[PDB]
Structure formats: C-alpha cells, structure tokens
Subunit: 99 residues, 3 copies
C-alpha cells in the first residue's frame, strides 16, 4: 500500500555536510540520504571562491523524505535562513509514493 | 516525443549491491542506475549494527525506470520481501517523462 | 514562495562529462549538478564495449533545473542528437518546486 510523501532536495557545498545533517535530524525528520556531487550555478556565492574560468565545484546532495509538506518546508527554511546567503545552495521539493 | 514511465528508487545497505541488482535484472527491467550514498534512518535494522552516537552509514541508491507501474511494484515487492526486515532499506516510486 | 521548474536528468558514459557539461552551459542553463554513477541498460551501444557476462558500467548522472520546459527540451535534444547513437545514454524530465 502507498503513502504520499514529500521529497526535499538540498544541494550545497560539501563543507556543510555535518551542519545540514544536524538541522535535518533536529527538525524531526525520520532520516536523510546524502550523495557526493559536483556542479556549477549562477548565484556566485561559494564560500571558498570561484575562478574566472569556471569548473565543477564540490558539493553534497541531500534527499529528505517527509510525511508532511509542513516538515519539508520547515527543514528547507532552516537551511536557507542559516546558509543560503553565505554558501552555494539550491533546494527543491516534489512528491513521491512511499511504501 | 514523450512516454510516461515510472521511477523506482531503492536506498539500501551497500552490501546488498549485487543481490538487488540481480532482482532488478531477473524481473525484466531494461536497466538500472546505482549511486554510492550514505544516510540515517529510524527503523534501526542495519545488519552491521548502529552505535549509540549515530553517524551516516554506507548505502547505495538504485533508480529503475519501468514502462509500467506493474513492473515497478513487482521489483519493489521482491526487494522488500527478501531484505526489508533484515537490512536497512527505503523505497519510493514516482513518474517521469522519458524520451 | 514556490516556482515550478523542470528537472532534466541525463545518465551517460563517464567519458562524456566535459562534453555534456558544455552543452548545458552553452544552452543557457543557470547551472547543473553531476554525480558519479554506474548502471546497465539494453540499447547496447557503449562506446568502450560490453562483455558477454554483464556488470555495472561507469556513468555520470546530470540533473539540470530549468525555468521552462522549452529549455529542458532544447538541452535534451542537443545531447541526444550529438551522442545518443554513439554512447550509452538515457534521459528523462519531471517537474519540481524550487524556492
Ligand atoms: N539550474 C541548476 N540545475 C541543477 N543544479 C543547479 C542549478 N543551479 C545550481 N545548481 C547546483 O547548486 C549548486 C550551487 O549553485 P548556486 O545557485 O548556489 O550558485 P553558485 O554559488 O554560483 O554555485 P557554484 O559555486 O557551484 O557555481 C551548484 O554547484 C549546482 O550543484
Ligand atoms: N526520511 C528519510 N529520508 C531520506 N532517506 C531516508 C529516510 N529514512 C531513511 N532513509 C534512507 O534509508 C536508509 C535506511 O533507513 P531505514 O529507514 O531502513 O532505517 P535504519 O535501519 O535505521 O537505517 P540506518 O542504519 O541507515 O540508520 C538510511 O540510511 C537513509 O539513506
Ligand atoms: N530502465 C533503466 N532504469 C534506470 N537506468 C537505466 C535504465 N536503462 C538504462 N539506464 C541507465 O542508462 C545507462 C545507459 O543505458 P542505455 O539504455 O543507453 O543502454 P546500454 O548502451 O546498453 O548501456 P550499458 O552499456 O550501461 O549497458 C545505463 O548504464 C543505466 O545507468
Ligand atoms: Ca557560480
Ligand atoms: Ca537508524
Ligand atoms: Ca547493455
Ligand atoms: Cl541522485
């Protein structure tokens, strides 16, 4: 049988791995998944800088499944409020069907 | 032109890489993608144990595209029936548009 | 507040990392995320070959968020037209909610 859940993705600088993991757990999520990633973006806020000739930068990608949209929004808000202006970061939400 | 397909995700202990790959292929999927991952969860069933002070554990993330919901459900069922009680594992389904 | 965006995924041979990154950026995307991956598929076109007894092959997974479906389709088209016949490659699109 199915249950509709929300999937929050946070892609951010690899150096924020432990800090963002703590926000997710402190907010009451049941868990999280994290993957190593790389990327480029257009906000140009990376804490360690960017060179003139761009190349892919080191990131992590979190995926957090939540039983309510409310909880996904809360985690997203906390990460963005704390880090979005000072660190490269992008975030999005969608829905999936959990078992 | 587009075709609606289903995307099954399985996130599980890294030690199940070969066993789960075999279920996916034996069920008739056209392929699979797998990524290294880490994570934490709340079922507390990891086959290799967890310590009192939790940290991220080693996982793999599979993504399997299927032409029917029926096939995604079958693969999901087979993995869950065989491994969910004895190994850390979470699974979800959504739809995407293949070319 | 929310904005509906499109998410284009391209999973392809690891050797195409720089060539596909250039298409994404030359098309005007605001960024991209890329992850190391492995997989198997059924088209059997891998540029470096496949053995009789299959095993997972080395890939990369791109995710590209776009503000229009039009731009996702354009990037997808350019990658497919250039590489799909000569290199292992699969691609799909869905929608997500960006902040
Ligand atoms: N359109 C996009 N599609 C997919 N991933 C994106 C996109 N834009 C940004 N990202 C991802 O978010 C990360 C941070 O991008 P951000 O928008 O915060 O701009 P930035 O500070 O310029 O980042 P970077 O230093 O990596 O260029 C990128 O490295 C990438 O992994
Ligand atoms: N809410 C969640 N959101 C995202 N990923 C999750 C979530 N819950 C669990 N996961 C992922 O599934 C994996 C296994 O979690 P499971 O629910 O089976 O509990 P567990 O046995 O307690 O896992 P772990 O030993 O990793 O803590 C986690 O390591 C994580 O990668
Ligand atoms: N049904 C699928 N679900 C998920 N990923 C898939 C699927 N089919 C293919 N892929 C991914 O796309 C990659 C390339 O598959 P493609 O369809 O191009 O066939 P191929 O040339 O036979 O690939 P391979 O040499 O990897 O077997 C695979 O390695 C896999 O990562
Ligand atoms: Ca940048
Ligand atoms: Ca646990
Ligand atoms: Ca093949
Ligand atoms: Cl991923």
């Amino acid at each position: 049988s199915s249950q509709q859940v929300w999937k929050l993705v946070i892609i951010t600088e690899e150096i924020l791995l432990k800090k963002v993991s703590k926000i997710i757990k402190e907010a009451g999520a049941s868990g999280y998944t994290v993957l190593a990633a790389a990327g480029e973006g257009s906000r140009n806020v990376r804490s360690t800088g960017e060179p003139s000739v761009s190349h892919a930068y080191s990131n992590i990608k979190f995926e957090v499944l939540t039983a309510s949209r409310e909880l996904a929004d809360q985690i997203q808000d906390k990460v963005v409020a704390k880090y979005f202006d000072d660190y490269s970061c992008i975030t999005y939400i969608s829905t999936v069907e959990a078992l």
